[PDB]
Every structure is written in structure tokens, then in C-alpha cells.
């Protein structure tokens, strides 16, 4: 199935670099070719679950060059038969 | 100084009724008078920290009439001197 | 009478080498609340009355700003009408 | 180098079925052979990042037989050179 996965990076860097590491994470996520939405606290991608999990492997390795330590959080909405961003939000927009 | 607080409610109810509990939470959050944004995974409010914490107390009691069991998650971005939704997202918008 | 559990995670925007002092102060502060608590690898879980914990969280945030000008603070609340406890969720495994 | 990954499952089922789905998840996690710790809110594994991400793919598919909709949350502590459960908790135990 197609699912949604919200991704948050919290790097262990001095706060003046915080936003920058996050920008690299967002840019990387945007390269995946999947529908995505940047929010105030996370970035949500919509796509096939196993592909996203593989992309998350690449994202973590990529982020090492910018931050030696970071928290990476995934919030997955897993639904048999699929769930999309629009099904979750369109009613409130 | 403001903070952002992203709020996620995950009720223990059959999938068919998920959307209803969430609707009520979003409706209640919209009543607070604070700037807010509904995302696919959470709803983010911007405002004064202690007031938001008091509003969260009210939200949880309110939700109990719709779901007897739920997960409530707050992701708070706390910055001395304040932080806003725009400072976090506007460059992607 | 009804309790909730609330797991608390602090992630400070400080260099890796200072992460642990902020977290230590957070844990020390949580332990002063008098509530049953358990420190885990990723968070610290308290069991107690919901509104009291929310008020303690207000104090926690103010307290922590001395040690870190910017931090993420995450709460994961298990809310159950009539109450839920740590033991009801983990005793099976311990 | 290891990471720690804290896993939370929140199924969209009635409250009476909730702890059961979670037990199935914990049992499956225990089959991975990795050091793990069950807590009140999540179960933390320590091991190699990419292997854990592949086990998470299997976990989601497995859980589908019990709950057709669920939230699955990963909180990953990622450190250059590795990080362990003991490094994170042993000071407070």
C-alpha cells in the first residue's frame, strides 16, 4: 500500500545551524519524486511504504555529513488498501 | 514569546469512527483564537506556552465524550524569545 | 482517582557533547514531582493526574530554558477514562 | 555502529483490542534477535539501522492481519560511531 509518513529531524547542533540541517533534509525528501508537504513540525510524504523506508535509509546516511547526531522520527499512517494526504486534510482546507 | 505546539490525537476506536473524533479535536482547537494549521499528521498551534497547556487540559476532557481511550501527543518547539509557524515554514511556501 | 501516563522527551538544540546535561536536569526535575516514573532510552514516563502533570510540564519548560535556549519537548499522553497506569501496560513483560 | 529505535504502534481498533495488537507487535520485535526493552509507551531496539528499517517493513505487513489501520511511530537516535541503550539509560539505573 500507499501510506503517509511524516518525517522530523532534530539535529544535535547549536541552534544557529538547526534550520539549515533541516533544509538539507527537506531538499533531499523533495528529490524522491513523491507528493510531499512541509509543515511547521515535520514533512509528510505520500507513497509506497517499503520505498519510503528505503529512502529513509538514504536520508539518514545523507544527513551524517551535516550532523554527527540527530533524532529522526517517522510517524506512519498505515492503512490496508492505502491512505493519502488529501483523505486526511482536504476536509479542513 | 510564542511557541509552536503540534497536536496529534489517535483515538482507540474502529477506523470508521477515527475521522469524527479528529474532527471534534480540530473544531475545538479552532475555538482557541490562536493561529493554527491542520496538517496530515497533526494540527499546529502558535501561541503562549502556558495558555496552550491549559487549552490542552480542556481538549482532553472534551474528547473523552467522543472516545474513552486515546493517545494525545504534543510536539512543542520551545525557543527563548519566541518561535513562530512562519519562521519554520515560510520559505517552503 | 483516574491517572494517565505521560512520556516526556526533551531534545535540546545544543552540540552532541552537551546533550546529556540538559537531559539530566530534565530527569532530575521530573523525579522531584513525587510521581511514579520510569526512565527509558527515549523518554521518561510519569504516571499521575493529568492536569497536575500538565502544570508540572509548564514548570519543566521554564526550568529548562536556563540550560538550553532552544529545545523540542514532546509529550505522549495515554488518556483513558477511569484511568490507566504504567503497570497495566508493562507488567506482562516484567 | 548501532542506533536505537523506539517503536510505538497505535491501532485503530476498539479499546478492548488495543493491548492485544500491541502484544503481537512486541512478540514480533522479540523475534529479531536484537537487544530490546519494552516500556510503557514504546519498545526500543538497539541494532544496525538499515536492518531495523527492513524489519519495520516486515512488522507493518505482519500487523495488517490484526489491525487494518494503525499508526506506527519510529523515534531513531542516530549517532556517528554508534549509540546504545546502555549509553542512554544506565546513568539513571
Structural domain boundaries in chain A: 1-93
The method of structure determination was X-ray
Q: How far is CA C84 from CA B53, C38, C88, in A?
A: 21, 15, 7
- CA pair distance C87, C71, nearest whole angstrom: 30
Residues C36 and C64: their CA atoms lie apart, in Å, by 21
Those residues with Cβ within 8 angstroms of residue B58's Cβ, 6 or more apart along the chain or in another chain? B28
Residues 6+ apart with CB under 8 A from D70: A78, D9, D10, D11, D12, D21, D63
Among candidates A36, A38, A22, which has minimal Cα distance to A70?
A: A22
Cβ pair D76:A72 closer than 8 A:
yes
Angle, alpha carbons A63-A49-C42 (nearest 5°): 55
Neighbours of chain B (3+ CB pairs under 8 A): A, C, D
Per DSSP, what are the bridge partners of residue C39? C44
Residues of chain C with C-beta less than 8 angstroms from the C-beta of A68:
16
Please check whether residue D38 touches A, CB under 8 A: no
How far is Cα D40 from Cα D55, in angstroms, rounded to an integer? 22
Q: Is D22:D10 a contact under the CB 8 Å cutoff? A: no
Q: Provide CB contacts within 8 A for D20, sequence distance 6+.
A: D66
Let me know if domain C2-94 sits in CATH 3.30.70.930.
yes
Classify C88 as helix, strand or coil. helix
Query: C71, B77, C13, C9: which is closest to A13 by C-alpha?
Result: C13
Q: Cβ contacts (< 8 Å) between A9 and chain C: which residues? A: none
Cβ contact, residue pair A69, C16, below 8 Å: yes
Q: Domain A1-93 carries which CATH code?
A: 3.30.70.930
Instruction: Compute the distance between CA of residue A25 and CA of residue C24 in angstroms, rounded to an integer.
Output: 29
DSSP designation for D66: T
Question: Cα–Cα distance between A80 and D44 in angstroms, integer?
Answer: 25
Q: How far is B61 from chain A (nearest CA, A)?
A: 23
Q: What is the largest CA-CA distance in chain A?
A: 43
- Gap between the Cα atoms of C48 and C2, Å rounded: 8
Q: Are D10 and B71 in contact (CB < 8 Å)?
A: yes
DSSP label at B93? -
Touching C (3+ Cβ pairs <8 A), the chains are: A, B, D
Quote the CA–CA distance of B45 and A83 in Å, as a whole number.
25
Q: List, in order, residues 6 or more apart from A83 with CB less than 8 Å away.
A: A1, A2, A3, A4, A77, D69
Chain D contact for C76, CB < 8 A? yes
- What is the spatial distance between Cα D46 and Cα C84, in angstroms, rounded to a whole number? 28
Could you tell me if D73 lies within 8 Å of chain A, comparing CB atoms?
yes
Q: Furthest-apart CA pair in chain C: how many Å?
A: 43
Angle between helices B49-63 and B18-30 (to 10 degrees): 140
Strand order of the β-sheet with B69-79 is B36-38, B43-47, B3-11, B69-79, C70-80, C4-12, C44-48, C36-39
**Residues sharing a CB contact under 8 Å with residue B56, sequence separation 6 or more, in sequence order:** B5, B7, B72, B74, C54
Sequence-distant (≥ 6) Cβ neighbours of residue D16 within 8 angstroms: none
Amino acid at each position: 500500500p500507499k501510506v503517509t509518513v511524516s518525517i522530523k529531524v532534530v539535529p544535535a547542533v547549536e541552534d544557529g545551524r538547526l534550520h539549515e540541517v533541516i533544509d538539507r533534509a527537506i531538499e533531499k525528501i523533495s528529490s524522491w519524486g513523491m507528493k510531499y508537504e512541509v509543515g511547521p513540525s515535520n514533512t509528510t510524504v505520500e507513497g509506497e511504504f517499503e520505498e519510503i523506508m528505503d529512502r529513509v535509509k538514504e536520508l539518514a546516511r545523507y544527513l551524517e555529513q551535516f550532523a554527527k547526531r540527530f533524532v529522526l522520527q517517522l510517524d506512519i499512517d498505515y492503512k490496508a488498501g492505502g491512505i493519502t494526504i488529501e483523505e486526511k486534510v482536504s476536509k479542513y482546507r
